[PDB]
Amino acid sequence: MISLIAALAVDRVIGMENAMPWPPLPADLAWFKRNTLNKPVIMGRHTWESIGRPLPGRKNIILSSQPGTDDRVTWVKSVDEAIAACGDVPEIMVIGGGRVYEQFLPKAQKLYLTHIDAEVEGDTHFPDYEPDDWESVFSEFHDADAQNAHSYCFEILERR
Ligand SMILES: NC(=O)c1ccc[n+]([C@@H]2O[C@H](COP(=O)([O-])OP(=O)(O)OC[C@H]3O[C@@H](n4cnc5c(N)ncnc54)[C@H](OP(=O)(O)O)[C@@H]3O)[C@@H](O)[C@H]2O)c1
Ligand SMILES: Nc1nc(=O)c2nc(CNc3ccc(C(=O)N[C@@H](CCC(=O)O)C(=O)O)cc3)cnc2[nH]1
Ligand code: NA
Ligand code: NA
Ligand code: NA
């Protein structure tokens, strides 16, 4: 089973100049960590560059046509290879970026989305999905606080 996990601001913005389009939201990072820990994570090369170190407690699989730049993670050259490299696990977590989400969304059976209540500039977007195809099975609204500058809502959707 393939799942996507992403944080989206207004107009589905996820990235700007190969970085996050907002300052860190520690609550969202905790959500991200809790949902990806002990699972394989698939990411695009640009997202690898934006993170810059292996995510601990996870099998890190990087999708790139280019030779790898770090022996601590697994480099693969195709979507099919990325999936194969995860082996026989219950859930593969696809963690972006925009080009990777586009390719895996049609394969996805679950989405873990953080809706970030911010209008910020972006050059990378989460793909358009048809809400009618998905059932919301979880939602939780949070306000901004001293540590998180924007309000946010966690949602989990399952494909009908
Ligand atoms: N808000 C969020 O939830 C979140 C999550 C993830 C990422 N982001 C942001 O999104 C941005 C990155 O997105 P992006 O679309 O520019 O890049 P990306 O999807 O992370 O990486 C794209 C790169 O991955 C490789 N790739 C993708 N598909 C491939 C395939 N089928 N076969 C071989 N290689 C493939 C290619 O690299 P090569 O050129 O090496 O071949 C491609 O240029 C960053 O700003 C990051 O901060 C945000
Ligand atoms: N919900 C969500 N929020 C994100 O910010 C996010 N970001 C990307 C890619 N960007 C990144 C950047 C940094 C870390 C990171 O340093 N994660 C730590 C956080 C642990 C914590 O702060 O509690 C980790 O161990 O997972 C993960 C993804 C992909 N999916 C996302 N999904
Ligand atoms: Na096996
Ligand atoms: Na197998
Ligand atoms: Na429901």
From TrEMBL:
Residues 1-159 form the DHFR domain. This is dihydrofolate reductase. It comes from Escherichia coli (strain UTI89 / UPEC). GO terms for molecular function: dihydrofolate reductase activity; NADP+ binding. Key enzyme in folate metabolism. Catalyzes an essential reaction for de novo glycine and purine synthesis, and for DNA precursor synthesis. Belongs to the dihydrofolate reductase family. Keywords: NADP, Nucleotide-binding, One-carbon metabolism, Oxidoreductase. Its EC number is 1.5.1.3. GO terms for biological process: dihydrofolate metabolic process; folic acid metabolic process; one-carbon metabolic process; tetrahydrofolate biosynthetic process. GO terms for cellular component: cytosol. NADP(+) binds at A7, I14, A19, R45, H46, T47, S64, S65, G97, G98, R99, V100, Q103. The keyword NADP applies. It is an enzyme of class 1 (oxidoreductase). Transmembrane segments: none annotated. The keyword Nucleotide-binding applies. Pathway: Cofactor biosynthesis; tetrahydrofolate biosynthesis; 5,6,7,8-tetrahydrofolate from 7,8-dihydrofolate: step 1/1.
